[PDB]
Design a binder for this molecule. Structure first.
Ligand code: HEM
Ligand code: HEM
Ligand SMILES: [C-]#N
Ligand SMILES: [C-]#N
Ligand code: NA
Lengths: 127, 126
């Protein structure tokens, strides 16, 4: 945990400073309420099992932001390839993530930092 | 609350100035009485959950005015998109908010300050 990490003089991860697994879970839940309420986005998920997806997204974001738990989902490029997702869609999704982070009280500077980790993933996500 | 924030040497926000979350609740109720009575505005709210909207409006205004809690609703552009809202409509709503603030006894100068925060939002709403 964070205490062990600090005892080892390891820098505080984004994961730890935003509140770890519980924070990520809450953010991902809200993120998906936002995404599924967005008529430009909801249809992408029509044939999707949301229950499982939220789980994999928690694992993915946690791992991306410095958490210890494994990602147990499929590779980004394979999952998203062929879904007709454009940079327009990717950007809307990123906007919803930023909104969920803001709603959870994460400082704007940290939101920007998180967008810096996530934005390069568009190369694997978009059509 | 305001007491703890002053102990931290935070400058007084507009939110804290006008009476905080409880003052904003009261203003928002009166605001919508005015809005829904306005024939030029009321049809936009046909079918709207007023209780929910009012709560999100309290959150929004409280946050914009420097309050302690984040806004948790949808952003202004998304929510108002495709409704054909014009500068005329926005101006009417801003007018009703100012009148509600006036009725609540907020000093004219502070209402002017609040309108300075609200008026730029028209780019997203319209
Ligand atoms: C913001 C960056 C994104 C990340 C980190 C991400 C991550 C993920 C992850 C972890 C999964 C689960 C993979 C699995 O099932 O093993 C997934 C699936 C999925 N993603 Fe994303 N994604 C992103 C952007 C997007 C965008 C922009 C769209 C469409 C607008 C999208 C649409 C989908 C859909 C529809 C699935 C589920 C496919 C199915 O039905 O199983 N994703 N994504
Ligand atoms: C003073 C600027 C305004 C602000 C701060 C504002 C704020 C908001 C907020 C916070 C919501 C709720 C968002 C959510 O559900 O997450 C909302 C929705 C809405 N607004 Fe505004 N608004 C403004 C101007 C206007 C104007 C000028 C109109 C039309 C005359 C309008 C009509 C509506 C309607 C119809 C909804 C949707 C209610 C529903 O979901 O059924 N707003 N607005
Ligand atoms: C993808 N969520
Ligand atoms: C919007 N009221
Ligand atoms: Na695919």
């Amino acid at each position: 945990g964070l205490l062990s990490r600090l005892r080892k003089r390891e820098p505080i991860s984004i994961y730890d400073k935003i509140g770890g697994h519980e924070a990520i879970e809450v953010v991902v839940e809200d993120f998906f309420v936002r995404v599924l309420a967005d008529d430009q986005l909801s249809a992408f998920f029509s044939g999707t099992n949301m229950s499982r997806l939220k789980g994999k997204q928690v694992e993915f974001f946690a791992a991306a932001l410095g958490g210890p738990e494994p990602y147990t989902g499929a590779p980004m490029k394979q999952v998203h390839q062929g879904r007709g997702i454009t940079m327009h869609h990717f950007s809307l999704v990123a906007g919803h993530l930023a909104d969920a982070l803001t709603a959870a009280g994460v400082p704007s500077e940290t939101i920007t930092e998180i967008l810096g980790v996530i934005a390069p993933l568009a190369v694997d996500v978009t059509s």
